[PDB]
Ligand binder design. Structure first.
Ligand SMILES: *CCC(=O)N1C[C@@H]2[C@H](C1)[C@@H](c1cccc(Cl)c1)C[C@H]2Oc1ccc(NC(C)=O)cc1
Ligand SMILES: C[S@@+](CC[C@H](N)C(=O)[O-])C[C@H]1O[C@@H](n2cnc3c(N)ncnc32)[C@H](O)[C@@H]1O
Lengths: 119, 207
């Protein structure tokens, strides 16, 4: 599971109703997996990321110097897009858990795949 | 630029289910079906390149594999069966496709999950009755909630009017873009005059 995928899984549309909460990520096994850089895609994704949930997850994977939000001019900032590409798409959770905020139940990630069923 | 025949050739190399589960209507999307469907999505509608795409009932991954080769930023496959997903992962690794992820879940129980999180949703859903309606209609409801721009799906041509009626009720634009036929697994032919194949519509839903 990539961090962009965690962000989508965790997401809620913010509106006039109360805040929704992300799945809390823990990992026991992580791998780095190069993905071909698509700066057009990453730039499209920047405004769609739920940044607080991304920061929490990244911190739990011991990622460092993580951008704290969208930078000035980010569509023209190749370094920021390259950094976000890596953090969103190339850091894969192989073994871990996603914890549901409303129940406290753990949903396992195994072989990179989150199992969201209520077994 | 991937031409139609090249795409179909590649999709013939996607391995299928090791022990397909009949109750889940497990069969791979057929290579000619997948190739024509994805080639249209990309070249006619531009609904794949640089997009985030969901493949509901992704199975062994034919539709996702093709989507990932057509320039998607990320294709996420969703399936209820872990054994299907193991095969899909193997297939992605064989093709060296790393703009893919996958998730085990029940697509019919995704209310309020990943709302408007995907550009495009694509699927070849099951047709079995689930709580009084086709499983494909449950998949459709989920797909429309998840997708921002477009849903592409295969529905029985015999159910066309019903699909059209639900789209109107939902205020969804509907366009029937092709009439297709493909073979079901031989084991599905359980009465004498049951056809071996199924007639489906490729349908584009949009907002
Ligand atoms: C807070 C998380 C939570 O309550 N659930 C319930 C599951 C799953 C996690 C939900 C979900 C959230 C985000 C992304 C996805 Cl892909 C899924 C949906 C909900 O799905 C299920 C699936 C299966 C059952 N029943 C059985 C018998 O397995 C219930 C709910
Ligand atoms: C015709 S197969 C889809 C073919 C797929 N595109 C492929 O190329 O393998 C239907 C798929 O739906 C999955 N499925 C069935 N019911 C499901 C459900 N409720 N939620 C998620 N997946 C489901 C099956 O496990 C199966 O892989």
């Amino acid at each position: 599971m990539k961090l962009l995928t965690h962000n989508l899984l965790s997401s809620h549309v913010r509106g006039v109703g109360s805040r929704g909460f992300p799945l809390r990520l823990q990992a026991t096994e992580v791998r780095i997996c190069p993905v071909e850089f698509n700066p057009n895609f990453v730039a499209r994704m920047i405004p769609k990321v739920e940044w607080s949930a991304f920061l929490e997850a990244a911190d739990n994977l011991r990622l460092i110097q993580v951008p704290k939000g969208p930078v000035e001019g980010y569509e023209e900032n190749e370094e920021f897009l390259r950094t976000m590409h890596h953090l969103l798409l190339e850091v894969e959770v192989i073994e871990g858990t996603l914890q549901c905020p409303e129940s406290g139940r753990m949903f396992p990630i195994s072989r990179g795949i989150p199992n969201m069923l209520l077994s | 630029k991937v031409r139609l025949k090249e795409l179909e050739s590649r999709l013939q190399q996607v391995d299928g289910f090791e022990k397909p589960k009949l109750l889940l209507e497990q069969y791979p999307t057929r290579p000619h079906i997948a190739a024509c469907m994805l080639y249209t999505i990309h070249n006619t509608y531009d609904d794949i390149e640089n997009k985030v795409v969901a493949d509901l009932g992704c199975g062994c991954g034919v539709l996702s594999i093709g989507t990932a080769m057509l320039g998607a930023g990320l294709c996420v496959g969703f399936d209820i069966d872990e054994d299907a997903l193991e095969i899909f992962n193997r297939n992605a690794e064989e093709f060296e496709l790393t703009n893919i992820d996958m998730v085990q879940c029940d697509v019919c129980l995704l209310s309020n999950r990943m709302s408007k999180s995907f550009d495009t949703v694509i699927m070849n859903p099951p047709f079995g009755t689930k709580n009084n309606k086709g499983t494909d209609m449950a998949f459709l409801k989920t797909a429309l909630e998840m997708a921002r721009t477009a849903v592409y799906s295969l529905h029985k041509s015999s159910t066309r009017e019903h699909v059209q009626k639900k789209a109107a009720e939902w205020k969804i634009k509907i366009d029937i873009i092709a009439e297709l036929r493909y073979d079901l697994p031989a084991s599905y032919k359980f009465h004498k005059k049951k056809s071996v194949d199924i007639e489906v519509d490729l349908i584009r839903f949009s907002f």
